[PDB]
Amino acid sequence: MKMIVGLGNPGTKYQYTKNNIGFMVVDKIAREHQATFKKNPFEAEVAEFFHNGEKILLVKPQTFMNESGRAVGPLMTYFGIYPEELVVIYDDLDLAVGKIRLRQKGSAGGHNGIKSIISHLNTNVFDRIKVGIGRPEGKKTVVQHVLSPFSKENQPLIEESMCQSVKAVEYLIEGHSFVDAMNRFN
């Protein structure tokens, strides 16, 4: 019973920011599967759907980025999902715009989002889909970069990456191991 977490900040004003790439992906997944998100006791938005029997959960934590694990951890202990079934989808500064990178473990940049999930799952090992958002080529700081939207030149690139992210999650859905998909998509 897979859980697919897409990281992000809550609110209309962050709905097109680089840091909400995870939200955008799990929204694409939700639409493709005709699923609706409902507010959940554990600071999250949760869409349920099936795919022959098996129950997939889509999770947008409403905790803000650095407290994601406060939502993800309890919600896994609630539904009974193990970390082997988890897939977290999020932004990655040190990966180029247009590129995606599936990894099964790691420190995961200096990502605050992942750091919270580590703390509350108490494991460094779980599947992840890094979507590259690039680093600031202008005068912006990191915080300005992630909490701003993409350029017009980068926008089609990220639509490419977001489709890939979806196709990877549909690959996993169709019964393929994350290791297979790591080879297929990395």
XYZ file of C-alpha atoms in Angstrom:
186
model
C 0.000 0.000 0.000
C 2.222 2.806 -1.322
C 2.296 6.281 0.185
C 3.466 9.068 -2.117
C 4.493 12.223 -0.267
C 4.905 15.454 -2.237
C 6.631 18.155 -0.201
C 5.691 21.833 -0.216
C 4.523 24.874 1.741
C 0.758 25.456 2.298
C -1.076 28.419 0.789
C -2.159 29.935 -2.523
C 0.934 32.157 -2.650
C 3.317 29.158 -2.677
C 1.324 27.122 -5.188
C 3.699 27.928 -8.089
C 6.996 28.284 -6.156
C 9.989 26.036 -6.878
C 9.781 24.573 -3.373
C 6.286 23.176 -4.070
C 7.416 20.987 -6.969
C 6.286 18.027 -4.846
C 2.736 19.394 -4.527
C 2.541 19.946 -8.283
C 3.564 16.325 -8.925
C 1.142 14.663 -6.472
C -1.571 16.937 -7.920
C -0.790 15.618 -11.399
C -0.958 12.095 -9.953
C -4.230 12.897 -8.162
C -5.810 14.235 -11.376
C -4.646 11.295 -13.519
C -6.310 8.970 -10.965
C -9.399 11.183 -10.525
C -8.770 11.485 -6.772
C -9.749 14.328 -4.421
C -7.646 15.647 -1.524
C -9.297 16.010 1.895
C -7.930 17.815 4.971
C -6.627 15.268 7.478
C -6.136 15.356 11.313
C -2.358 14.988 10.841
C -1.599 18.352 9.199
C -1.898 17.028 5.642
C -4.056 16.724 2.545
C -4.733 13.089 1.716
C -6.096 11.574 -1.490
C -6.971 7.868 -1.475
C -7.275 5.774 -4.625
C -6.904 2.128 -5.689
C -5.178 0.276 -8.555
C -6.606 -3.244 -8.463
C -7.132 -3.798 -4.730
C -4.103 -1.899 -3.414
C -4.584 1.389 -1.561
C -2.334 4.283 -2.621
C -2.257 7.438 -0.482
C -1.218 10.853 -1.795
C 0.090 13.195 0.875
C 0.674 16.946 0.852
C 1.932 17.945 4.355
C 0.475 21.281 5.483
C 3.157 21.667 8.166
C 5.494 23.877 6.128
C 8.679 22.323 4.787
C 10.928 21.951 7.847
C 8.218 20.173 9.885
C 7.027 17.717 7.223
C 7.803 14.657 9.354
C 5.327 15.769 12.023
C 2.676 14.965 9.384
C 4.329 12.073 7.538
C 5.531 10.016 10.523
C 2.255 9.818 12.548
C 0.223 9.393 9.346
C 2.296 6.297 8.514
C 1.870 4.940 12.061
C -1.851 5.692 11.656
C -2.549 3.883 8.388
C 0.152 1.284 9.077
C 2.312 2.114 6.043
C 5.972 1.070 6.405
C 8.875 3.239 5.021
C 9.575 0.659 2.296
C 6.176 1.610 0.825
C 6.876 5.376 1.113
C 8.014 7.568 -1.775
C 8.828 11.217 -1.031
C 8.888 13.662 -3.963
C 10.685 16.985 -3.523
C 12.866 19.776 -4.920
C 16.674 19.560 -5.144
C 18.862 22.639 -5.660
C 21.976 20.715 -6.738
C 20.099 19.009 -9.575
C 19.567 20.837 -12.864
C 16.202 22.086 -14.125
C 14.696 19.381 -16.359
C 16.424 16.460 -14.599
C 15.017 13.948 -12.077
C 16.954 11.607 -9.767
C 15.527 8.578 -7.942
C 17.476 7.608 -4.792
C 16.731 5.068 -2.040
C 18.717 6.757 0.749
C 20.967 9.680 1.660
C 21.356 12.901 3.640
C 19.498 14.522 0.711
C 21.299 17.841 0.178
C 20.732 20.024 3.211
C 16.997 19.629 2.592
C 15.038 20.674 5.671
C 11.974 18.795 4.382
C 13.843 15.475 4.254
C 15.543 16.216 7.597
C 12.153 16.328 9.343
C 11.048 13.077 7.705
C 14.298 11.448 8.837
C 13.693 12.571 12.429
C 10.116 11.245 12.639
C 10.610 8.047 10.613
C 13.949 7.482 12.391
C 15.499 6.144 9.182
C 17.675 7.615 6.428
C 16.486 4.923 4.001
C 13.303 5.466 2.012
C 12.596 5.919 -1.705
C 12.685 9.470 -3.111
C 12.215 11.305 -6.428
C 14.463 14.379 -6.531
C 13.202 16.976 -9.014
C 15.916 19.469 -9.965
C 15.102 23.168 -9.567
C 18.627 24.525 -10.154
C 20.498 27.102 -8.063
C 20.205 30.944 -8.255
C 22.129 32.319 -11.262
C 21.111 35.891 -10.335
C 21.311 37.990 -7.149
C 18.731 35.852 -5.294
C 19.409 33.993 -2.056
C 18.399 30.341 -1.716
C 15.248 31.267 0.216
C 14.221 33.720 -2.525
C 15.028 31.131 -5.223
C 12.899 28.300 -3.819
C 10.035 30.588 -2.728
C 9.853 32.226 -6.165
C 8.278 30.602 -9.290
C 10.218 29.314 -12.306
C 11.367 31.479 -15.212
C 9.488 31.390 -18.525
C 12.560 29.699 -20.059
C 12.629 27.068 -17.276
C 8.856 26.511 -17.179
C 8.676 23.968 -20.091
C 11.749 22.183 -18.689
C 9.988 21.641 -15.347
C 6.831 20.481 -17.143
C 9.143 17.877 -18.687
C 10.571 16.883 -15.276
C 7.116 16.829 -13.664
C 5.807 14.452 -16.333
C 8.835 12.208 -15.765
C 8.140 12.283 -12.017
C 4.559 11.186 -12.720
C 5.632 8.479 -15.184
C 8.073 7.127 -12.575
C 5.277 6.991 -9.970
C 3.033 5.222 -12.501
C 5.890 2.777 -13.178
C 6.033 1.966 -9.456
C 2.222 1.780 -9.398
C 2.235 -0.755 -12.267
C 4.209 -3.181 -10.049
C 7.848 -2.318 -10.843
C 10.473 -2.167 -8.084
C 12.054 1.223 -7.316
C 15.391 -0.344 -8.265
C 14.182 -1.115 -11.803
C 12.853 2.459 -12.076
C 16.116 3.831 -10.651
C 17.824 2.293 -13.696
C 15.025 3.320 -16.076
C 14.875 6.968 -14.981
C 18.320 7.859 -13.589
